[PDB]
Symmetry: D2
Subunit: 337 residues, 4 copies
């Protein structure tokens, strides 16, 4: 029997998750329900038409007053803001993909379990006693008896992979980081109220600085990096695809070329499929739909004074993350005891 999956929050990560899964090969999962404040009208139209991804090459037509049909498969489209009131027990849901961005805390994520679901995966950094995992970095450490887990944030998944390599092979004493990130739906379209007075500013018109937890989050999946990193973010006028700029003071003297090699190795061995060295003089858009969590721009790699390293890595924050979420969902399935 295949694991039954419910998607809470059919937004950007929610919809990228389905389209990722769809393109999967022998998914140990079966998306059978969606939930979101909108009904079939939105859930359907928005899954078929995407300004970022494009039109979904699949049949996406409503399927009755409460469901959509994707290539013959029917998916229940429920619509209740209160997770405690979802047909999870009634639909026999195994894994819930929490993509609302408003149930990332344990008491909130647990509501899904109270409602029937046996497990919940927060598509964002979690709050509370929530184990955090990053595929290719430490998801191997997951345990079947853990009901609620976090897949972290899109920046930690780009950072973690190559921080692992850098630390292991050179020993990261300390470092700082900056992610020039594509704007998200959290910022405003035009100057408007927001708890953060910077995110309140017209998103597509500005370079908007904002904090990030990635630098400190890395320490959750890479214990050794605890207290060593630190960083910020610069939201820029692009709809998707971002880049993280890391500078670390390594313990072992090295050079740009030696560093890029280390990555290419990793790309072939342990981080096979998660990391990827690019040697082409490309640009942001060239990475739309990149299945890699982190792609080093090898030619940008710098080494100042023998031990100060600069590394720029690309990532598609919507797609790349979503794929990762799927990989973690598959991991949670394969450990299903």
């Amino acid at each position: 029997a295949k694991l039954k999956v419910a998607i809470n929050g059919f937004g950007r990560i929610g919809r990228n998750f389905l389209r990722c899964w769809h393109g999967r090969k022998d998914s140990p999962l079966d998306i059978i329900a969606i939930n979101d404040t909108g009904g079939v009208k939105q859930a359907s139209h928005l899954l078929k038409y995407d300004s970022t991804l494009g039109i979904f090459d699949a049949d996406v037509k409503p399927s009755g007053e409460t469901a959509i049909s994707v290539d013959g498969k029917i998916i229940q489209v429920v619509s209740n803001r209160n997770p405690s009131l979802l047909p999870w027990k009634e639909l026999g849901i195994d894994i819930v993909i929490e993509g609302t961005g408003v149930f990332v805390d344990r008491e909130g994520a647990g509501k899904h379990i109270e409602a029937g679901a046996k497990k919940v995966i927060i598509t964002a950094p979690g709050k509370g006693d929530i184990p955090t995992y990053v595929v290719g970095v430490n998801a191997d450490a997951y345990s079947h008896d853990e009901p609620i887990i976090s897949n972290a944030s899109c920046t930690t998944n780009c950072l973690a992979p190559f921080v692992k390599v850098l630390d292991q092979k050179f020993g990261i004493i300390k470092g700082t980081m900056t992610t020039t990130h594509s704007y998200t739906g959290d910022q405003r379209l035009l100057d408007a109220s927001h708890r953060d007075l910077r995110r309140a500013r017209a998103a597509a018109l500005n370079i908007v600085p904002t904090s990030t937890g990635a630098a400190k989050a890395v320490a959750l999946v890479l214990p050794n990096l605890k207290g060593k990193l630190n960083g910020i973010a610069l939201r820029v006028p692009t709809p998707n695809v971002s880049v993280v700029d890391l500078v670390v003071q390594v313990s072992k003297k090295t050079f740009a070329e030696e560093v890029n090699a280390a990555f290419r190795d990793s790309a072939e061995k342990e981080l096979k499929g998660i990391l990827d060295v690019c040697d082409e003089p490309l640009v942001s858009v060239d990475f739309r739909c990149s299945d890699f969590s982190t792609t080093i721009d090898s030619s940008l790699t710098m080494v100042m004074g023998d031990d100060m390293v600069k590394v720029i890595a690309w990532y598609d924050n919507e797609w790349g993350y979503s794929q990762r979420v799927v990989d973690l969902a598959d991991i949670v399935a394969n450990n299903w005891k």
Copy 2:
């Protein structure tokens, strides 16, 4: 400087309104209250820094604990979602500029009167039987009796002025209209749930067609055009300033240079300070902060088959419309029995 004003909803229109007023000489109005759910802190910032208007050149310091000082003017910042509860009777408020876009009908805007306010000017099309005006067109018909009134939409403020001219000097049989408009708060930064599947699409990435009653609305301020006009709107990737494309069939044969000559007459006469004719080959950004609700782009004026006329008009949907809310508010102020 005489009548006490309170601004409900300190969004784009509200703040534009405040700056417009702040710039008038010898004013009937005195702004003493801003209701904003975001608090003094947020109001002070978004008023001072504007991604569209630039830094407001005035000393904007907070005043006391619940007010702000604009060039020495103390303005109270209250904060309640329910208009019925605002300290209007307490502050002595005469006119309320409804700028939330969620209290457009009588019961809605009516709450301000319950609250102690004497009159309400809805900065948007009203719902049901609500007096509607357009300065330069029918604002003189305002009766000091009417407690709640409408200043129509920004597009309706661009048409009426020159449709008044076309229908008068050429008789309008019928026409159609398409307004290439800048995006606005009602659109989504990225594809996301919205009642209008067109508006749910990433604003700064597409050309979004959307309906608009502006066409029909002209029939309220210019009775003669009832049922004669109709149109749509195409939202485009610009933060501010819009253009109206009008095509009317007149009854009196004519040519381009005459139509334009006509518009220039209204400019120096019955439509001074409202209608304007531009002869230089400009672009949208050149019309930022234009005090004219409508500016004809003469070199674009075309006449096909002696009586099918096309007129292209420019307008700052934010600024210009606000200059009009102030004008209507001034009319209300100088007709206070």
Copy 3:
């Protein structure tokens, strides 16, 4: 089997080669590219496209004077002068002239005046010059024509359904405005330009720009001379445009009648050319469409029984390029 040479490896040039590469069995064999920017920049720019996406194939350079696209090998020359182009030495029949410069006989000629026996200007042509819009009057093409124009992306969207309208309601007169994505002609930031409007920052403004498009329709549909006209409105999108046609017909009519008319033609004389969309979509949705003109059904309006307003979507780069790869097919076919 009919040696083709792409002159000007720009948006169209490169969009052209990709559309063609996609054709299941073309009578066209592209043997040479000629741009003012070396082979490397040629292979690279072809492989990665901000608007099209990564070109799914194998675009690796084959030597310092040619590239190997998905097996085949295309020579890549580089000369600012057509006269100096190795057309005879390569045996070119038709040179797709997509540089934007040589758009008249004296200019486009140098190509034929150096080898090629036929040129297809990917834009309007100066004065007396054979113009063709596939699906409207491409049949009138006689092999006698040494040079021909495939019109502009807008005329190819306007001509199709403007025909359907006249043939079914008869256009008395008409006006037209095109909300168009900016293009290479425009400056990135305010900088000198012949056209004071095209000098303004493309991505920051709604830029009014004049166009032939409307009058052009007259050329492909003689029955419209002296009736249509209109301006263009450049907007902050890098691709896809929309034409807003307003015509006064003689035959009293209404919205759904007009649409019904479009839907028929859609699956008859205009299948693959015109299409009717009944979905509340947006510009980006129409990226890579193969129809010169896609009517946005729900936007069709009719005032006073005989004033019709129709909105049609078209990918100004791909859609147009597809027709160029067709007006080439037309040519190849009627080869005497």
Copy 4:
């Protein structure tokens, strides 16, 4: 006195320079000639209308078919792409503002001298060993017998001022830098021909990596920094205003607060008018028209491990740089032997 000035390359810097100068009071300069490839047509129109600066608050209009008048002051408008053929000897041109970005070496700039002008100020880095200066950092070292000088790049002018403070106050051992920069006229609107395959990609749709010689140009005006810094650039979809993300390893151990304090200190003394510290949460737009070459974003300053400092400074590449160009021209005109 009052040296006669000529502007070569009426581009962004050329036009911003004129407006910067125009706004000065008591200027030792008098701009009396403009050379570009457009003539009075473009010249008048583009000086008046600016999608970035807005409408120039001056009476701009052509004077004859070979000059223009700005507030009555008439300025010649020549048009020859070959400096050698410029009317410098007859116009009595003293100093030339070279902003074509194509005559940036001695053989190039020299052509202006060969044509009559006494001095040349390259509004960009010079090729070879042209005397480079950065106002506030070393422009005082300028010598009257140096015919051709360079005002360095815009990034260098931003970075130089606060690098001067950091090294002076904490001692810079080594550092790396990343400038998220607005796109300029050197990038292409849509994917087109360019020697650089990154800058070839549509500018307003990507984050574009691109080299920068700023990091090492700093060593030119602050010798102690030679060999110690490297860096990269990332062009983003904004029309104007940039930010440099600087990370350095210092000798003296410090903390975020100590660093900012030093900037404010310098800000009020040695770098007065050149450096500023911003304490409010602003975005890129809020910095348009800043006369400072470098404005620190105090709240972003971080220190990791006692001595790895990360500083962020904003700057209007166009307007800011131009203000410094006027300053360098003043400096040149005040040591006129």
